[PDB]
Design a protein around this ligand. Structure first.
Ligand SMILES: Nc1ncnc2c1ncn2[C@@H]1O[C@H](COP(=O)(O)OP(=O)(O)OP(O)(O)=S)[C@@H](O)[C@H]1O
Ligand SMILES: Nc1ncnc2c1ncn2[C@@H]1O[C@H](COP(=O)(O)OP(=O)(O)OP(O)(O)=S)[C@@H](O)[C@H]1O
Lengths: 350, 8, 350
């Protein structure tokens, strides 16, 4: 039979931690995509609507991770394109149509199986207009990209070179009214725009309020209050946002979340390094006293989960540089002190 | 084909 | 199938580099661990093995570009040195990010399976660090935009490269999740931003302490205290730094280190001139008294090892100009006075 939101969410939890609201949106969309296509031409409520998804969150939150993990369990075709390389009006870079062409490579040129596929885009913020007002001069990597996607998302015919071609004499028609699009990107600087709109203080006098330094505009609580009008001041056009009604607000990694990300997931960094030394005939250990200490260092970097290797590799630099030369080494232990740099990791010999 | 000419 | 060890490869780089013990350890661990991730053929329990790029930072002429060059000699896997000054945001006339890949295939003989396990090096990365406030007024084609494009290139993607530029209208897909990147560029002005974070005070008031020159920060020590948040003020994006967790800080040249550079390395400038006159049938000598004077003159120039030839060639100009015309000259001696310019270099007659 078909899957369910509880079953699909249980799978994503194995690879993703600390994202409750984000998993709910993707589960309903995927669970609803099978319903729309299955009911196509068989339900009296013809011309079923569509609802794309627009993910938003800080860096290292798991946006690109969800698209990869989703393809593992997803049956229908899936792709991972990028907005940065697209170019409007057939310029030097690739065109919008190239997105559909990549889908056929994974679908084996199955048009009937390609129309029911899913599409994902990363780094959507790169095409945002730098200024709120429309640019006076033409743009090749901004607003124009949004314009070309309008007819694509809603639904339009497309040209795809079947084999051994770039441009014009064989074109395969593929509708796009039923194709799903999952756009995502960490919009930088959006916190400043929402503060002007939400705080509204903008004053120095007695009556005006002066928020106490460092106890305001928490990124997690600020993105939750986002609205489409906020994105207009960022640079996006309202016509583009109208094509993506659904919006998902993620949260920044909690200190407790980082401890779980290194233990509960299967692809955690702790398990990765453990396998790196497993082939070397050497074990590894990571006590809880060291994990909680690493969380404070990571959050200070404000880079996300991806800024964790700098704390680990900087500590195990000396150890890894000398471990291969050493012999009769069966186990390595890294206590909390090693992380601070005031001690050296203990070694166990056979 | 396409000319990207911009000046600061 | 016995692979090299960090101690063995470090001995090779030590022959060509001096006083970079901190930087050599990072390259050794990365190159060592790069073969381990390559050795695996999906026969291990660990999945989605992590990657760890490197970010080299150092003063001018400290030897950053030299480490990558000598590394490629002893390296079996391919290697490249792609200039980043000419990189432009994809979608524009000047350049594309794809060009880097095409270079890698020329070295690997268009071996996709062999190119994916290659190494990549980038120089002059500070050239694209935009120093400005949020750029609402204009979009930069070489600054912030280029860095965003690189994000897709790293952490895993599929690109398009012509088959040697095209004799077809077809491209080859090459993953880059396993490809390592070593970005490096002397960040000018990074000391001023770090000083504000570490000095903590202006000191125009009665209570505030003032140590203008007694406690003035040392440039060498200061770079050791760098962090990702410091780079955000410089112009780098957090998304870009997260892809490069490891960081390598290099120390400035010292009077003692400069003397070793002229004697221990095989490619030293002293040995270069020794061979220049060997073809002419004349011997060359360099006493220790002259080396100590050259070190003091080079440090004042604030240029590093690259600013040493100006001290040598400016002194031996007159001597080289009339050396071929002279006959029966078999040996030349350069005294400390020669560097000062008070006297002339003694000549020997056979
Ligand atoms: N929720 C999470 N649980 C576990 N690991 C995570 C999570 N989010 C991020 N990570 C780690 O961070 C790595 C990168 O995650 P990404 O999805 O690339 O983050 P990101 O926000 O998509 O980065 P962008 O979109 O390019 S700014 C993953 O490979 C994981 O190791
Ligand atoms: N440790 C060293 N030992 C010997 N010669 C060195 C050393 N470091 C630098 N040099 C000399 O400096 C030359 C250039 O070194 P580079 O690697 O270009 O320095 P750099 O830090 O890369 O400067 P940038 O980054 O290109 S501005 C080399 O060809 C050597 O002649």
């Amino acid at each position: 039979a078909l899957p369910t939101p509880h079953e699909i969410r249980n799978h994503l939890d194995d690879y993703v931690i600390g994202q409750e609201q984000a998993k709910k949106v993707l589960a309903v969309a995927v669970y609803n995509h099978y319903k729309r296509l299955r009911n196509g031409d068989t339900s009296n409520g013809v011309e079923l609507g569509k609802s794309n998804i627009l993910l938003i969150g800080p860096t290292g939150s798991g946006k690109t991770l969800l698209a990869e993990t989703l393809a593992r369990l997803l049956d229908v075709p899936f792709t991972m394109a990028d907005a940065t390389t697209l170019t409007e009006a057939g310029y030097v870079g690739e065109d919008v149509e190239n997105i559909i062409q990549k889908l056929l490579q994974k679908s084996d040129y199955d048009v009937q199986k390609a129309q029911r596929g899913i599409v994902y885009i990363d780094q959507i913020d790169k095409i945002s207009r730098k200024s709120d007002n429309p640019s006076i001069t033409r743009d090749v990597s901004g607003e124009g990209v949004q314009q070309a996607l309008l007819k694509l998302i809603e639904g339009t015919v497309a040209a795809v070179p079947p084999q051994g071609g770039r441009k014009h004499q064989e074109f395969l028609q593929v509708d796009t009214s039923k194709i799903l699009f999952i756009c995502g990107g960490a919009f930088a600087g959006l916190d400043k725009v929402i503060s002007h709109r939400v705080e509204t203080g903008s004053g120095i006098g007695f009556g005006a309020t002066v928020k106490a330094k460092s106890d305001k505009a928490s990124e997690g609580e600020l993105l939750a209050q986002v609205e489409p009008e906020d994105l207009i001041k960022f640079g996006l056009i309202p016509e583009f946002i109208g094509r993506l009604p659904v919006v998902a607000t993620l949260n920044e990694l909690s200190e407790e979340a980082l401890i779980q990300i290194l233990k509960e997931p299967k692809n955690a960094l702790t398990k990765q390094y453990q396998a790196l030394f497993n082939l070397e005939g050497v074990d590894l250990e990571f006590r809880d006293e060291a994990l909680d200490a690493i969380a404070k260092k990571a959050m200070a970097r404000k880079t996300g989960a991806r800024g964790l290797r700098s704390i680990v590799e900087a500590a195990l630099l000396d150890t890894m540089y000398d471990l291969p030369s050493m012999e009769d080494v069966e186990k390595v232990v890294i206590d909390e002190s090693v992380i601070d740099g005031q001690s050296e990791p203990l070694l166990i010999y056979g | 084909x396409x000319x990207x000419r911009x000046x600061x």
